[model samples]
Target chain A: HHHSGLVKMSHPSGDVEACMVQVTCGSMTLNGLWLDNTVWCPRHVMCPADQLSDPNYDALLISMTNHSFSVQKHIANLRVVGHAMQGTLLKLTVDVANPSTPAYTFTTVKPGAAFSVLACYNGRPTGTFTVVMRPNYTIKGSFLCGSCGSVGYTKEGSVINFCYMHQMELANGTHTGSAFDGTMYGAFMDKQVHQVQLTDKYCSVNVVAWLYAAILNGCAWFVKPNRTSVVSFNEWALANQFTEFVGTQSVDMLAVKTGVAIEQLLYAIQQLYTGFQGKQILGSTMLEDEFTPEDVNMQIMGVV
Target chain B: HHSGLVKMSHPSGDVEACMVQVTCGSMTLNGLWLDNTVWCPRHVMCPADQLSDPNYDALLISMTNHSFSVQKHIANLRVVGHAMQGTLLKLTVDVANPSTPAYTFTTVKPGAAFSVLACYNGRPTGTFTVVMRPNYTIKGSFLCGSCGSVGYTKEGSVINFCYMHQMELANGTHTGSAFDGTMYGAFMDKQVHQVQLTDKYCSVNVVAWLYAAILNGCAWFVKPNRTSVVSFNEWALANQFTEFVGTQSVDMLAVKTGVAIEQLLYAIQQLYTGFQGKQILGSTMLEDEFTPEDVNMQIMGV
Candidate 1:
């Protein structure tokens, strides 16, 4: 026997509407994105594992596995050998086990000292190894939404309906607009919408969009960006009233008004790229005539 | 037994070579030098009952009767205070206390209006006033590894050792490593590990580091290194691992060498007084560069 999960989207007319859902596990028929089995994001409803194959689900699976879930040898059971400080300077020695090699000790001196050790098991230098300390700031009334999700500022906010999973799902899909709509459906359905707050330090629209882009591309993708590309669009455009096709146009206007005319072009290109794979998504032509040589220059800023 | 203090410097170009040594105890003088006397550096032993000993009396009298003198490495000691947006007022002092010594006196009360007063040898040197405001919150992060300090001040953000104590202006070119760049610019860019606290809270943390730099001859003096001075800026030095300020010949050389005994004594007294004042005058969350747990447990002898 399979457990039935309810995915409800709140209608603007003050009504709760059922949203078809899909899952990657066993059997149940529903229509929507594939629910990836990760603790980072959450949806409100419980659903049976198997879903009818959806194009969005397939694309998300490919994207999530390609960019986010790249397999690496996890380093665990790190032992600290010793540490010493002179003035504000710190020197630390740590012994870690690398499966392919014998246990080795590495030294890291910080503040003004630089020492590079193998960051990976295979001795690659693309990354630098350094120790960092984080501040534990305890704010009143704030709780972690999930074990590995954003800190939600409410008592009733559950990891079940938290938007982190939905956000990641949208970010990892070809139809990110639909994914965005799906997330709003769940957030309002659970009445946890107000728990989301905007501040310069956290949960800004720009940050959300940036997070989406970061998830879509590799972390190194942000090494550079064109000034007027979709990469530079305001996050607000993607988040505001984003449940409809017109909402997508609104996002297009906001991006262009904010000096990011390339967003519309990039979105069009994305649609075309995804269309070739049998998801023939027809986008608006409102931004097709807006491209110029300046736009091209603006788009090439990512080139080093 | 009186605690004995030894001061030694490595030979020029040889870090392991002990070039000169001075101790306040009886010892066989061999390859190392002992040039220890009252003038060189003293370990004056005072028995609990013999408080009237001439040596002890003279040392106490000399310290108590020491004249006060201020040292200025430069002439431009500007203290500008301005009333900014909201009830909080901004105070800016560009006095580089290390090169040209400058004294900044700050108060730690949020209830009443606060004012800035600069002093030279117990006299009012400069003063500025701003209306007091309460509920000014301040919090910052202590980033390890690069051991840099970032402070959010009423005047904006302040970063130390982000690039070897180099000044990075607003929208300035950043060449530091990714870790330093993120921590140093997080508040301004709203990236990560940044929180905007109240005006008063922010100002105190900024002033604490500045106060320490003034007390110590150099900003880096607070760094853990073998320096024959005392300011209690670094933990090891504050915990008394090495010689005390009164026992260092470099501190007393002003008396024996052309530098006046009273002048050197005055400087040491200022440093001690200022250091004490900083500790007492309400502190922000930043105790030192890192938390004690971070030092003792995270980056200590395992």
Candidate 2:
């Protein structure tokens, strides 16, 4: 069984129609094209079972490359230079595209804390956020359709459907979208679609996306420490009944939209993250577009 | 068009279909018969809205009959009582009525607290629906673990779902099950003990109740306005541990046993009062003052 799922698309005749996207073993090209690659993506990515048992897997690093003539995606590979778990502040650095960019630092631990402008991977738009499926179990729906798409070692799998599995609120306490919109499928924020590609051999998400919606739908597989397995994208989301193909968020956007902090908002998130932390997740191996076991740490940003 | 909603019932043939239940205005003396009262047993009623505004209008009471038994609950409002609302408690009666049922529609101003009661004359205690106005909440916690509090105006969505069930929102019912142990599970389904968390935004130490039960098969909670801590076993041989009996305070229950003369003294107020019609019209009292209390005799009395 190839790892694939059906995706919904618009039908003109006032009816609902769908399309199918499938996950296959593929690689990238010298020109940043995904259809080709040197190291074929794995088929079964088995994360060490103990890690799954633990929910506190926090602080993961997703490095995006700013391709040059090809590898220009490093523009989004922002670093988690420093951070605090008690609703304090986060530290980040640089832009290879523009070296002297002042360091943007602020508190995201509070609710309502957001960047002025949204950041995206690769640029304008690559994939749309839509609900892929409503599982028989707890993956209930409000169409919570502002979805999850694409995960990859080499190629992002398919269209991502994102929605709420958990009830979440913004810093200002507005009810953001949920897994279901109650009747029709709606997006997460007022503006729903996102750029979700792993450009220049890298894919990444910023703290905003991490806090607002990503955690509920994001999934990843663990490669063996020795770097010697032939498994595929070991879809970790089935544990909750639905499968999400989500791509990366860019780091470039954080340097913009900023706001003052509110303790209650921060405390709420700390409590939510504390849910995943009853434990801890990555960074730093961006040179070759490949990953190192040493670069994947699971105890960083108050998550798991 | 009495206020009510349709609720689900079970079906047959191994098919996942349903049936319904309804509520009316009669007070059924028995629990099994569902047709009499609109207060469907265990339904979560959200009465925070007084049509609108929080402080301006709290309780609005309506009677099924214009006159009958227990004639005192309606002496004009405290539908939703707060320790700091302006209105004082009011109580009245129609003790002379052969059946002169009265009604009331009242409002709560910025600062109101209430202490009202009702009594039955004879027959059954008749019917009435009491409700408050609508409101909003921005800062609150969806509870789990620990015992803490939110501000007077902000709110808390009582902890729900330690394990999956049909729901976790503000209202609904359950048909019971095992291994249920969280605050909600303890209160709604598993009547393993006595713990009432309340209609008002009151509270109890969930962890205290929980660990106490798990450690020794016993737990405790203080009903609002009660003198002693109510204690009991987790699952009973002869008790209904359903619905957290009531929300209460910590071991600090000791703090209010008698009176900390000093603390009571600290409760003094610098209120304004009308002075010969010219002074601060309705307030007076220094913030710090010593009131009368026979300390030694009170201790011996205790």
Candidate 3:
């Protein structure tokens, strides 16, 4: 006698199933599937807690396919070579901070300042660590530099573009994520800082290799502020790369719940990062969906 | 004898014989056309408290021909209708609450609870009050029946937008501004609630108006999430109509700062009691801008 999985009960395979998940109150069914647990009511096929509508699931699956298959390209950059040392310090003040000054002043000698490190995922923060003033140590935290170069001309010759470079210095120093600042609704991630700087010279290190915030404004929802928790670099988390990537599935699900239309984070990628490549760099070459050697910040710091 | 009026020091009209009073930086130039007062050193022209800036003086006065104007358009929507409220109250099985049923169940009799009153500004709370019985008082809030309707079109053509509206309801009571949620923010302006019911079945008094947050999002540099001061609905307090219109040189300039971009508020005419023709709505229309009667709100008994 072939035993049928009782409704709302355990499957013979010891698989558990449920009628619906905690998010939405509805569900669909699947044919015979292998399971370590028994079948149960609501069929316990664990859909990700953040999956949105049925369509978003399909899109995420497609993205996974592209990440695996696409190989990419890039261009030679007008690189500025400097001593780029631990002692080279740039003392900067924002126009918002003080409208008047000698504009900016840089100190070649490093100054002593405490540094903290934290690893973040999604918008929420995780592991954390700290270090006191140290000489010649690695430095990592984003910097706001104004006087770096002349604002520029676009190849299109249509508009005058500004050339600005903001830098983040990162050197692994026992990083820890942040403790929560309770906001009480939805995934309210806490703010975090991950940095390594030469106490003597305030030069940056461990840059996330992502684009600057100003350039990413149009694509920011995908680049910085998304609320997915799959990988470490969804489009939303792209802005503050130190944070976690909200998965595509999660973002779409957010759309369904919040009435936000499902959006393609990749188009934003093309708009922000593609323009500056100077050559035919396909979207695939920009960010390999799977993690790469460059993704490991601490190891690059020689901390591992 | 010519009686010439001293323009600067004239207390009244000219009363004496020919008297020409010319004062430059408080120096009486008298009949002297060009001298110490007329072409005085830039420094001496300035008072002891008000030092002068030569360059700034030139720049500030460069735009002498600029003109500004403000216009107001007010609308009074006397919405009178009723709406349905739904709730998903769960019965807690706690022993402390007992088997007496932690929540009131719905019955066919009398259909549902009802409350009626007038509203001003569409604000969630009003001076008019009504008592609800053994169930619960109507703490106004709204919920999305379908999760897909949170910020977009759900099924067939129903526009659902702005998450701040729903989040405010899910988390009962006021928490903080949709922007910076810290307690340090403004209180009077931060408590804004927008609710919606399952099916559209209600209306209320509303003062209408509009504005935009611009491209950078939330105009973060400005009020930061509007501090919950949604819907600019007061004519006098609306600086755009009263102050900004007169000071701003052009409509485009006002547009950049967000004003008068769209015509949403409707205008009306008042009838004079004296003349029979005054009762006609056409020729007696008067103009006004945002008033307290144009605010919009959604229903949320749930």
Candidate 4:
């Protein structure tokens, strides 16, 4: 008789049916395939913790594809110099020659600090990208740096064009019947680079506020008082690299429970600066998302 | 004719003699610095304040040139005497020791209404002053316990006196204490600095008093609650007071109570000043007999 707790599992060579162990809870099956100990909850099976999300998978595939293509073309070489915050962010460098050719590079910005990227293709210059990180969690007890720009560029006569993959095609290789030659490939991977510049709006007010404090402290150290000047994006970016990255996550989380939003605090700082003649004192940077000349004027008029 | 009083811009100064021979008919000198008529020869005065007093005066008389005639004003005393024909009282002044006399001597004043006219065949001389100008003793203490025992006695100019023992005055000065040789100065500068408020008026001693109150089981006043204790434990961790406690022994009591020392001191300060919410988290933690693990659980919401 067939066992009630087990079902027949087949083997390739033999027809000897073996019982596949199974367990059930709340009308749901657990280990029905008789696999090793595993969580068979509905959510767990649908979104396995080991599998990356679509976006994350895309990012990884693109990163590998970009590096391989760059090396294959002999235009550049990409190396992951280091990583931080438990491998969530990577620090990469791409060395290149023949600036007239297309290429790709990857990098990360320190959270609450300035980051920028420029893209060009076929000796054409593209636009610059910049952003700052938010003071919230990107993972358990960890936060992401501001936004990052993923693009490649090359300089041309008067203008620069952007470059990236229009499409990527991947093929799997099969094992050959020979001992020495084991795998097969047929146009396994492919990519395309084009010229472009993309403008993205990113938050930076919190970093600006923190940098302002550091600048004021610097001024005080020199016995100079009451210095009012704009902090350039370069200076703010430099300050971001000033310390080992750590966060006030626990304290912030507690405060968040008390109805204090970090984003609101950042907004308040921006508003406070605007309430004064901040535009006149703090000059504008082309890289900032919200602190544009138009935004400044409109904000002064309370339209923003 | 102009008055014999010549006011020439007060080469030194001038003063009016308010009363001549103004005697207290029925008076008792209380805590006088000097004995009556026991003239200090070194200081040259019949009455003196103290050796340190600026008003102490002494007059030197040369017995070899003794004369019962016109007296000269020397040092800071005003002498008044006249020549007398006297044999019945052959008074010879003597100051064998520069501080006292060999015997006693009293001569009549120049403006005396009556005098005994004695006939004599020998020459005898003495010095007398019926009316004299000297410093009067005022009520003062040579040393005050609160003033850091500075030994400063200001009868009228009292600014140098400490307003209170605990307060640091604004004029960039603190009162010295007469009890400087005791623990008073050490108490204010050393012990007080450890726990005194950064402000001008609060005190470190308040913590001690509150500590005593809590020890005596005055739970209502302290209002010990678990939330406060948990909050304080978190605060201590946030501020890195755990390291401070390990590295220093300054606020061990609060550390032992499983709370932030600064918060504990702050609570005690507030309670001492009659504020509410003085006894919260810490009280709860203590009452619940919380351990280090319990404190961690409270913080982590376990």
Candidate 5:
């Protein structure tokens, strides 16, 4: 394949009828050193229709030890509308082939208010922002696809999603994210996904892989929390449980690319932390004196 | 009249026919004074007709001065229901007025919360304990009249000069007494009546007398904060206004009661402060971080 031009390569197993396409850094390399086709490289072989119901299509995880590696991806173009005049608009792009390009827009109705974008790549999100819809009234921002080998737009054009369960605002009144302040999962923010190892340690990636790893480690008792953590990687199923797993596959792929044990642990820890803080849950009693004793406070587990 | 029995007396020119009544204490006559014939000591009063008003009755100023005095008269009895049962009934036979004996009944229904009573000659109450409802699954409370001289029980068989405003507890939250906390005209726990003299000095007449000594002569102009305090009594007239005086009788009352001078000033200040604090006029934006420059804060005045 050409490095900067379109190129095609034969699929594995040397099947003459089937072939795979490759593009990298504005160039296409056919039958060359395709990073994805490498033995240890993560594979992206899903059809467009398969993406509709796939969590893999929602988030991405990538990791690299050298810090010399960086990649660009293609995501859908977005348009934003309906904001208070002179507010701000933020544009974040994701990469996926869907029927429609998803675009999320936010406007500040009042000064010092906040707007937010909850971007999920593959099954996880990269980050959230508190953007200001300023006097100019326009903002443009974007996100990267972790696993797709490409960047695509968001799913359903919703600028907002249940990140854990707290509101993650893109356009914001505050500079730092206020989505998860006191939640137990909040500690996960400090959890990094690098230097992964097989040893039992508290890392974001480990938390995510813990359940999956349990199946491999023959640890039967670890199955329950693992299964729960893994199954809870998305909103509808785990709702407040989906945490730490944002971006498409950059974190995971980066870890895999470098074969770093610490990276995996860090990744899993992040997800565990986010899921821990998800959504309006029962029994969050802060103002018991003001509220009726019978009144139950709603606890929200959101992105940490 | 018994010493502890509460009464409504005419301190002016013999006020007529007070309907509802209540009483408290071993009895003391400390705040005694006379204007004309109408006399009301420190004891609180609720009007009869307004008390019966189902919606807004049962509101009145509470008078609690220990030296306060009232008329030697009171309602023969103020009863809530028609009859009493079990151990609740206490009948008192008056040998002097044998035909008009008085009776009181104890209620098993806990009402410290559900019921508030305006006592005539009893202890002055500031704090109220909430009493739960037990029997009758029902409770009753009273509101005072506009004139603040009578009391009416809600849905009770007694004190029934029914006004349109009162309501049952089941139907509504009990109305607060028109006399609440402290305000201008009725600011003092006990109502006081005095007169003004030429020298501008003031004296309170403890015993009933013909000509009286007025208490607030040059007192209005005495204090620097008293500049805006000169606003006369507005409630005593038909047309409420901002001017210092209007009809001659209004001027006469202002001069006589001394209420218009400082008392009225105090009430006006209370109205403004309460409005700012959400206890009075109740402007919605005032509760927010709002400045009056953008819009008028005087919507009520408008």
Candidate 6:
């Protein structure tokens, strides 16, 4: 029995993909997929929850491929990442917090502070552990950083092009898998500190990464606002090997160690830089289909 | 000018005291940081016609209005207040023909989740909301007054509004010019940055109110259709007298607050005079529920 609606999701980054899922009255929450017991956003998508169009799908299977069921019928039918992707798969590692500030190259996730840990399926970017908590320790919630296109590049040069993915916040109700994993894994998941974790995923856990707020803001993401959340994507560097390779423009050797192609890593880094600018990082990266804002010119209290 | 706004000549930069005295009148305002005031110490965003009244400084709200405050105990927290001054109650504002139960503070509980929504301007133009978790801590996306939102115009440009909390007068200096913790619609933007609007009257003298509104959202959406909507923010008032319910013992870093609220109070120092504007009818969220039309998906023109 399939009960849902046919919908298409458009990410603000100019990416579009769709599938079928549950539907409810306009008066309730929808979309994403039902996981464990709660809804977890398997992929960041911007789709308006349309008013229930057909009441029959409440118990029938919906297949989007054939003339179709408004959307995809099976929860697993959607292909969110991997081989069929523009960016390389990201690998990550977690570092233990010390008496002060410890070591390693990585991203952070503090408990209680809103944190997002990336989720992947067989090394492909799939979804995120959007929710992180620390009631039980050891469980880690780290933002996975360091994924570049096999097509890598040096920091120097006259430069070329870039791209960015806007970070869209999940609706309040969706829980991260970590929220569920925290319960099952017990003391292994820690969302309370300013760090990241592997949470039992593939990809060699590297060290060091800080950056949240925007996935791409012309590196303006590095501009800190003083006492900002310690949990917001805090990273040091991409480790010595990756840095040294990129420094010497040694793209292939770095790819050999990271598993991602050098070409893919370079392309991915350029995509990260496109998330901003008036030249100052214009527009947000969220999948805002219609609610996109526009520009206006007017005078207030006198000066133009 | 000695009595420019605050009656007590407390200090040159005593912003906290200035906020309380202006909102409650004559009382030396003190308490947790959230206890200060949510109503504009000065009637911000109100029609420019009113900003010029000779009695602007003495304009305390009218008790007859009966709606600007909320007093209650909910989810292990204390939300008590007396409209001794008045609830700034309900306001009817028209932001480009839209009608809203615009100016008022109310809480909506759309299920297990609780949120506070603040709306202002005609037809309920601009709004800010604060949503809380079961533990009483605010959710990150909605915190630090981080979520001020509004609907777009037919042309799609946002008829953006600003919080008058802290702004510089025309000269762009933070002297005794203008800047009362209030709100007003002023500015046109292709992005989130507050671009000065080309208006001779609309919140004319002040600069950076949109920055305030966005950073410190004036209202938050609860849900489309749900049970009752209750406030999780400091400004909500009890419908009548009610008992507070929920998990967790109160004493949180803040009973209810938007993250940037603290910063706004410090930066905006003009003593406000009163709270009264276009009064409208209808429940805060019932008549002005946040709908699909209220937000912009992607921001452009930056």
lDDT of each: 0.21, 0.18, 0.18, 0.21, 0.21, 0.20
Minimal lDDT window, size 10, model 5 chain A: A293-302
- TM-score (chain A only) for the predictions, listed in order: 0.17, 0.17, 0.15, 0.22, 0.17, 0.17
DockQ category of candidate 6: incorrect
Cand. 6 TM to true fold: 0.21
Q: Model 6, A1-304: lDDT tens per residue? A: 0101001111111011011132221223223322112222211121123422222231222211222211122213322211111111111111211121211111223232222222221222222221223322122321122111101001111221111111111121112221211121222211212233322211111111111111121223323323312122122113211121121222223334334343332333333344433222123231111110000000010101
Candidate 1: fraction of native contacts reproduced: 0.00
Candidate 1 vs candidate 6, DockQ winner? 6
- In the range A1-304, model 3's lDDT, one tens digit per residue, is 0101000100010000110011111232111100111111111111233452232332333343211211111101111111111111111111121111111211121112222222111111111112222224222221111111101011111211111111122333211111111111111111123433322321111111122111211222334343222342343444533223222342333334333232223333434343435322112224322111121211111111
Can you tell me the CAPRI class of model 3? incorrect
My TM-score estimates for the predictions, one after another, are: 0.16, 0.16, 0.14, 0.15, 0.15, 0.21
Write candidate 2's Cα lDDT for A120-140 as tens digits.
122111111111112111111
Poorest 10 consecutive residues by lDDT, candidate 3 chain B: B4-13
Q: Give the Cα RMSD of candidate 1.
A: 30.4
Which lDDT value does model 3 have at B198?
A: 21
- Tens-digit lDDT string for candidate 6 (B84-187): 11212122111121111123222222111111111111111111122211111221111111112111111111111112222222312110001222222332
lDDT-better candidate, 5 vs 6: 5
Per-residue lDDT of model 4, residues B220-253, tens digit only? 4443322243454455443322211211322433
- State the DockQ of every prediction: 0.01, 0.01, 0.01, 0.00, 0.00, 0.01
How do the residues A1-304 of candidate 1 rate in per-residue lDDT, one tens digit apiece?
A: 0100000101010000011112211222111211121111222212223322222342333333211221111212223343322211112223432222211221221111111111111111111111110011111111111111111110111111211111112111110001122333122222222232221112122222232222222222222243324333334324432111121332333344334343443443333322334221112211121111221121112110
Question: Residue A300 of candidate 4: its Cα lDDT?
Answer: 20
